[PDB]
Every structure is written in structure tokens, then in C-alpha cells.
């Protein structure tokens, strides 16, 4: 398995548990700091990073009824410059660029308590697919499915429904949607961290998946495994292999990595492409920093890069 060593450039640092790198519609860059604490209690932050200077600005410190959040993953919205944020303590949040936020739901479509979320991914139809490795959201005691299999997967539909699509995962983490050339959602890819497995489902429609299958295998015996992921324009899946010092690259068909990217740090956590470029921004937990490197090609367009009123 070939391994490349691209040049990594430091962007900024000192961001506890650096995660969820994302770009909004205007090209602004954001990341979350889920491990920031205050007196032993969660006080995670959402930050905007000035790429020119690397200077940080906390735009939001989510808290609901005295319960601080643990924001971990983000997705940019198309129909408005707002961010959807997976929070391990608060569930799903919608955050405005001015710092105002709102909790999306405390219960799913079946009326059961919402679980803490980790990452999310929009399909081109506007449906948001979410991984939920934590137990019930605040005020319930914080728990995570690292050992027990109670992690779930949700789909937040365009018509505002929060539907659990599956469960029994041992820490579902990264998640990505594979689209057909016609732009139709084809497959859902879900990372299950400790098991070193990538799972796939066939997407038949909103909140409708079937044919669960082991899609890929993550290398290493190390503690950890697949964390965040994203597709490049050719549908190659880049996966942060937390604890391995590498970012695995899978071909459209899955299986074993077609190649690996060696990182100058042991714990890559998540990644994201800068729109219209080959630039990938990577968050990592060794130094709690954000880095960037050049990929061999542009990233797959994110949902908020698509046009609602586009002819072609
Ligand atoms: Ca994650
Ligand atoms: Ca990403």
C-alpha cells in the first residue's frame, strides 16, 4: 500500500480536541473545540479562524439550561449561511454566523430521547445524516458507546423529521454520502471507530437505508480508528485514522485503502476541503491544532456549494 508524505502547514493551535473543520457559504473557516472545560464541566466552543493570521474567535459557546455542549462535527447549510453542529451533549444544533444558536430536537420521530451526536453529512437532496455515539443528551448523565454498542445513526430530513435509521454501533463517528454522477444519493458510509470498520448502506430515499455491509477495513492494531471523513471529486474517501498517524484513502469500491497519507502527528481527527481547491484542512489531537496540505485533486462539492436554482 503506497504512502505519501505531503507538506503539512500549521494553521493555528491550542484548540482542545480540535474537530469539525468546515467552510461556510462565504468561505469563512470554522472548527469546534469539544474538550474545553470550566470547573470540570463541558464548555465546548465553536470558533471562526482567520486563515490570513490564524487568529481565533469564539463565536459560540453552546449551553442549554446550564448544560454546556461538546460540539464535535459540522456541516454548512445551502439555503442560508448557518452551520449544523453535532454536539455530544446537546444533540443537533443550528448555529448562525453571529453566534446565535438553537437546539434542533430533544426527541426523535419515535418520541424517544435524542442521543449525543458526533458528525454529520448532507446529501445533495438536503437531508442530513448524523452519527450519535453518545448516550442521551443533557441533562442525562454523559456516556459514550466506546465499549457498549448503543451508538445510533439519524437522518434529519428536509421536511424537518429526526429519524433514527439504525443503532447498535460501537461509537459511530465519521459519516459521508456517496452520490451518483447525476447527483443522486447512492451510499451512506459510516465509520465505527474501535472496530476498525467502515460500514455502508444503500440509500433508497430520505431516512431510508438498507443492505448494511462491511464496506472497508481500517489498518492498525492501535487504540482508536476511523474518525472524520470526506470524498474528493473522484469519489475517493479520505479517512482520518486516529491513533495511526495516517489518513487512509479508499477507492469508490471500498475494501482496503488504495493508499495512505502520513501525517506529522499521531491523532488526525477530522478533515475538510477548502471549496474549489485541492487544499485539505486537518484537525488533530496530538497538539490540538489545525493543519493543511495539498491533495492530488479537488474535493467533492459539499451540499452548501450546490445551487438550489441551478439549471445544470
Ligand atoms: Ca468525530
Ligand atoms: Ca469534513
**Into how many domains does the chain fold?**
1
Residue 276 CA to its chain's centroid (Å):
19
What grid cell was written down for 62? Answer: 453552546
Per-residue DSSP letters for 268-294? EEEEEEPTTSSEEEEEETTTTEEEEEE
Q: Which ligand is nearest to the CA of 272?
A: 2
Helix, strand and coil in the chain, % to nearest 5: 0, 50, 45
Q: What ligand has the least distance to the C-alpha of 72?
A: 1
Cell readout for 268 is: 488526525
Coil, helix or strand at residue 304: helix
Beta carbons of 191 and 198 less than 8 angstroms apart: yes
Measure the CA–CA gap between 186 and 250, rounded to whole angstroms.
17
Rounded CA separation 113/181 (Å) = 37
285 an active-site residue?
A: yes
Centre of ligand 1 from the C-alpha of residue 40, in Å: 22
* Residue 48 to residue 23: CA distance in whole angstroms: 10
CA of 77 to the centre of ligand 2 (A): 13
Sequence-separated (6 or more) residues with CB below 8 Å from residue 281: 11, 21, 29, 271, 272, 273, 274, 290, 291, 292
Resolution (A): 2.0
CA of 182 to the centre of ligand 2 (A): 22
Peptide bond into 139 cis (omega under 30): yes
Q: What's the gap in Å between 230 CA and the centre of ligand 2?
A: 5
Question: Measured between alpha carbons, how far is residue 168 from residues 94, 132, 147, 148, 152 in Å?
Answer: 26, 11, 11, 8, 6
Q: How far is the CA of 191 from the centre of ligand 1 (A)?
A: 9
Among 47, 38, 39, smallest CA distance to 12 is for: 47
For residues 82 and 75, the answer to whether their CB atoms sit within 8 Å is: no
Q: What is the extent of the structural domain holding 132?
A: 1-312
d(CA 283, CA 206): 30
For residue 237, give the ligand nearest its CA. Answer: 2
Residues lining ion ligand 2 (Cβ < 5 A) are 230, 272
CATH number of the domain enclosing 150: 2.120.10.30
Ligand nearest to the CA of 74: 2
DSSP line for 81-120:
SEEEEEETTTEEEEEETTS-EEE--SB-TTSPBPBP--EE
Q: In whole angstroms, what is the distance from residue 295 CA to residue 237 CA?
A: 12
Q: Are the beta carbons of 76 and 97 closer than 8 angstroms?
A: no
Ligand with minimal distance to 73 CA: 1
Residue 253 neighbours by CB under 8 Å, 6+ apart: none
Task: Decide if 118 contacts 88 (C-beta within 8 A).
Answer: yes
Q: How far is the CA of 31 from the centre of ligand 1 (A)?
A: 12
Ligand 1 geometric centre to CA of 48 (Å): 18
Choosing from 179, 246, 272, 285, which is the catalytic residue?
285
Sheet holding 185-192, edge to edge: 172-179, 185-192, 197-205, 208-217
Q: State how far the Cα of 103 lies from the Cα of 123, in Å rounded to an integer.
A: 21
- φ, ψ of residue 79 in degrees (nearest 5): -75, 10
Ligand 1 centroid – CA 204 distance (Å): 25
Amino acid at each position: 500500500i503506497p504512502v505519501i508524505e505531503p507538506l503539512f502547514t500549521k494553521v493555528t493551535e491550542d484548540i482542545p480536541g480540535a474537530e469539525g473543520p468546515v467552510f461556510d457559504k462565504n468561505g469563512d473557516f470554522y472548527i469546534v473545540a469539544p474538550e474545553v472545560e470550566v470547573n470540570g464541566k463541558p464548555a465546548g466552543e465553536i470558533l471562526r479562524i482567520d486563515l490570513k493570521t490564524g487568529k481565533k474567535t469564539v463565536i459560540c459557546k453552546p449551553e442549554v439550561n446550564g448544560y454546556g455542549g461538546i460540539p464535535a462535527g459540522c456541516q454548512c447549510d445551502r439555503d442560508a449561511n448557518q452551520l449544523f453542529v453535532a454536539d455530544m451533549r446537546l444533540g443537533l444544533l443550528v448555529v448562525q454566523t453571529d453566534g446565535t444558536f438553537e437546539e434542533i430536537a430533544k426527541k426523535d420521530s419515535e418520541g424517544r430521547r435524542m442521543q449525543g451526536c458526533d458528525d454529520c453529512a448532507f446529501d445533495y437532496e438536503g437531508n442530513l445524516w448524523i452519527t450519535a455515539p453518545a448516550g442521551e443528551v443533557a441533562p442525562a448523565d454523559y456516556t459514550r458507546s466506546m465499549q457498549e454498542k448503543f451508538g445510533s445513526i439519524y437522518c434529519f430530513t428536509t421536511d424537518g423529521q429526526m429519524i433514527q435509521v439504525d443503532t447498535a454501533f460501537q461509537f459511530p463517528n465519521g459519516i459521508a454520502v456517496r452520490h451518483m454522477n447525476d447527483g443522486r444519493p447512492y451510499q451512506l458510509i459510516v465509520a465505527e471507530t474501535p472496530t476498525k470498520k467502515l460500514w455502508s448502506y444503500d440509500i433508497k430515499g430520505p431516512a431510508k437505508i438498507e443492505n448494511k455491509k462491511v464496506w472497508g477495513h481500517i489498518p492498525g492494531t492501535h487504540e482508536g480508528g476511523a474518525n472524520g471523513m470526506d470524498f474528493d471529486e473522484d469519489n475517493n474517501l479520505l479517512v482520518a485514522n486516529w491513533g495511526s498517524s495516517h489518513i487512509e484513502v479508499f477507492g469508490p469500491d471500498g475494501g482496503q485503502p488504495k493508499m495512505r497519507i502520513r501525517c506529522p502527528f499521531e491523532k488526525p481527527s477530522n478533515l475538510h476541503f477548502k471549496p474549489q481547491t485541492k487544499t485539505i484542512f486537518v484537525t488533530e489531537h496530538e497538539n490540538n491544532a489545525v493543519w493543511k496540505f495539498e491533495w492530488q485533486r479537488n474535493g467533492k462539492k459539499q451540499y452548501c456549494e450546490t445551487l438550489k436554482f441551478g439549471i445544470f
